[PDB]
Amino acid sequence: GIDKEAMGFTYSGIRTNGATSACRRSGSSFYAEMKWLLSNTDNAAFPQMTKSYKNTRKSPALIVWGIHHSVSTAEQTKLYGSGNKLVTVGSSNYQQSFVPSPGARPQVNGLSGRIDFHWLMLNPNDTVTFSFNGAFIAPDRASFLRGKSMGIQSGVQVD
Amino acid sequence: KNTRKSPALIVWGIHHSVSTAEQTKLYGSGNKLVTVGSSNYQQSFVPSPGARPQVNGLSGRIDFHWLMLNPNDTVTFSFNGAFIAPDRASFLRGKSMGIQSGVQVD
């Protein structure tokens, strides 16, 4: 199983209420544990931010974030502003960086955008730190493992 | 769009030029970028112009990429230059087995 804990990210100078007609919760909503960070007004500048989280627990933590692949180079400037958008993730053993791939696609559930997810396991008493310029699907809740379990794939009923 | 019943094989190429000057000679100045997108795939390709030793007398390179395109699914290319475009997709016929040998057939 999985027990969640809030990572406590505050934001100022940007919008956090991105939503879509594909995550339909009595209207247009988004992922529950994620926040779609946007820019205040359309085409405005996204300010570069840095947000850390320290795994204060004894089990290892599971940090999950997303990258927003806009439909064009124009829509990316609409949501986050002109400029190259860049997300940088890093912990005591993790060192990567992510860039969105804005460009034409076919339609999937009537949308041509994509949102792709990445994950890393933060060690206990470690610190994850995000720096980002935009196009970042931020997390709100780290996940923790409860114990031991089995996992199968089937097409028959339980008993 | 893959009109057929079986998955398609899509291949394209990126021409990494000898220098920024030859890249602007063939496609013009300004950054280049080739985005390839489908329902299960989307990636960006930038050429890497610069100096490197000769091979077959040539310093340029053309590296090929590929993906599998599912039935009724569309692959979309957007390109600024440095893009080797494909003329023909490929569909696998049936069953076979491949080996590596150094002797004659019989």
Add this chain to the structure above:
Amino acid sequence: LQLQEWGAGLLKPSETLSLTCAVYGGSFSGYYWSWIRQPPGKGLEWIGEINHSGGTNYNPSLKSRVTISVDTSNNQFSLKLSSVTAADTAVYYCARGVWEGSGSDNFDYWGQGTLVTVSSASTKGPSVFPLAPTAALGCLVKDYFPEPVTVSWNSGALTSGVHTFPAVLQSSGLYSLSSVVTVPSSSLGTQTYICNVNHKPSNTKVDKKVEPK
């Protein structure tokens, strides 16, 4: 779904168009709520929108004029523009736009629209000029306000041939129209044709007659 727009419908330039629109069910935070106007001639213009949180998305053309607000507790939202001009005369719809973005990708279930006329005063009355000529001749009822106007011919003794046209609203905010009568060609010069224009809102009457050249 219910979508009801109401507010000041009859104002003059430099005043402040204030409208508001209320809803049924389907409550806020599911969608972006938008104001979209439409001049009575032709066109469809998006002017702004706002969500349950009060976050705005304005048209920059009309920004510094548009201010959009939301009464979330009463489930309605209001439009405040502007230092109004005359070209804002339009049918104003509120509409539910579906939240995609950051944005309002499409609009489903528009409201019914309330007409807002921002013309300028006043009851004026026309000037009438003759129309020189088988063939046909008429009158020209120009620069009058407000509508409508009677166009008699021979004070009412000629009905067949008349084609009193719909008036046009000029850029001056005053209406203008013309009547016309077809008549036999070689029969002219031998008989008179009075046209009796009547404009009751300014109490003016004319009996202007028409002759060929």
Add this chain to the structure above:
Amino acid sequence: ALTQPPSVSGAPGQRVTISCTGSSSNIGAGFDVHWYQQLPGTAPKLLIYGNSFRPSGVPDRFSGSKSGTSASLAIAGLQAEDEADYYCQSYDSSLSGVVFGGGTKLTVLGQPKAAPSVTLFPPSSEELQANKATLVCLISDFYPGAVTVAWKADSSPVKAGVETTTPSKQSNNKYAASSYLSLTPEQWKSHRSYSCQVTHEGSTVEKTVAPT
């Protein structure tokens, strides 16, 4: 920056196309194009969304598509309940906001195909004395009810001074429309001639006036 034709005809049941021509800042970017149907007096209902998808209760007759920098709506199986105005709508980035079209007037047939019937009056002497001039272009007895006027001074079009009326149902159940041109008296005198040309679906019908 979205261009739609003014009018399109069509017999009951036949198929008809409405074009939504756009620039690289609206449809050329990744933005989707939707369509809206506005029946007389009624407010627009949502039609095709996402360039091909139609919401509940919209027939298969209506079919949307999008190609490059343009979009297209298709109506097959025309009925009386389909005669309306149709608008395409997308989003533009260089203007930072959504954008609609000019609208297209769908006229379903069921009548003849009569054309104008234009009669043009030159300015009267009595109004030239008052230091004014206004030419009068009259249009009657045409079906369907959607024209496109254009004024010229013996060669050259006149963009300003024109007021054009909305068509309306005649008593003879056909349509009728007028258009007036405002001029200064010497502008009227200092030109060879003037011409009010009126285009109905595939026919230009023009009149002419010269100072005397």
